[PDB]
Design a protein around this ligand. Sequence first.
Ligand SMILES: O[C@@H]1[C@@H](O)[C@H](O[C@@H]2CO[C@H](O)[C@H](O)[C@H]2O)OC[C@H]1O
Ligand SMILES: *[C@@H]1O[C@H](CO)[C@@H](O)[C@H](O)[C@H]1NC(C)=O
Length: 319
Amino acid sequence: AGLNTAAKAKGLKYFGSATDNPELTDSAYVAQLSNTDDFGQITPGNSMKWDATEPSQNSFSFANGDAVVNLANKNGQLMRCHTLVWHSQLPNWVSSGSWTNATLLAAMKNHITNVVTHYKGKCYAWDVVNEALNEDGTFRNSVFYQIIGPAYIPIAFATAAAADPDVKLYYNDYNIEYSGAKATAAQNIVKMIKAYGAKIDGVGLQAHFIVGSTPSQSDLTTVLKGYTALGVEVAYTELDIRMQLPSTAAKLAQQSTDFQGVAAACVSTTGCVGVTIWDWTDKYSWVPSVFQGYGAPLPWDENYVKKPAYDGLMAGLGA
Ligand SMILES: O[C@@H]1[C@@H](O)[C@H](O[C@@H]2CO[C@H](O)[C@H](O)[C@H]2O)OC[C@H]1O
Ligand SMILES: *[C@@H]1O[C@H](CO)[C@@H](O)[C@H](O)[C@H]1NC(C)=O
């Protein structure tokens, strides 16, 4: 019937989509977001981030996050919860603070505990730490890394696990889907967290790819298996495949094969639990604002009509 029914028939837990609160006023959009043939899972694109949930220290704010949860609940969809510790979309109080390790650690742990406790029982997974790596596999020099050092990562995991022992704890990043230093370093994060004694259940592979420059099915699969070998699950968490504009029939067909290999790589790897696309319609993609000259990244176009990539996904899912 659709992406999610096809995914589930192959043993995935879900096919899903991100969304964001301003889109939830668009009835046509919401109708399709709510189509569980296609979407069995939802991620809030912005409303569970630190700026949204803790705009002033110890002052939490859940209305916007909860509104996305409530829509998933209405539909019977799972949630992925995104994201507890990240260098982007931090409120001023974090980014401007005079911190010691002790004071920043207290603030970070209190952020995690409060946000995870709030959502206890509501999330399939949390992206506990997002984008902790540079491209060469060194640690990104965020405020957390500068002040706390590498331990921030396992401390964040352990804090989330204490607050909600049931939810899957993920490390999420981009450019860790293909073989290279960054993916190796992501494997090393998994190892480090466990060496500390902290819980990590999953690796989240953002999968912000480029039409005609997407990792191959074979390399995607080697990489997924390099994480599942470590005793963790994997998921593609933010899949989109941006094209150099203008859109053409040939680019749309390439985009289809590119999507197809992602879905098929997941199916081929036991322990790949699902795929989430980073929204589902080109209208609402984050891409054009960030990647100048790129766009049209998703399986439906800006008028909510299926593109060839929808069929590529279905083919990769063996439907
Ligand atoms: O802020 C980050 C973006 O920098 C990131 O950008 C990457 C850059 O390397 C790539 O070409 C990858 O395809 C892009 O997504 O994407 C995630 C975002 O949060
Ligand atoms: C911060 O403190 C924790 C002990 O609670 C520790 O694991 C870590 O090394 C410290 N980091 C720095 C840079 O002092």
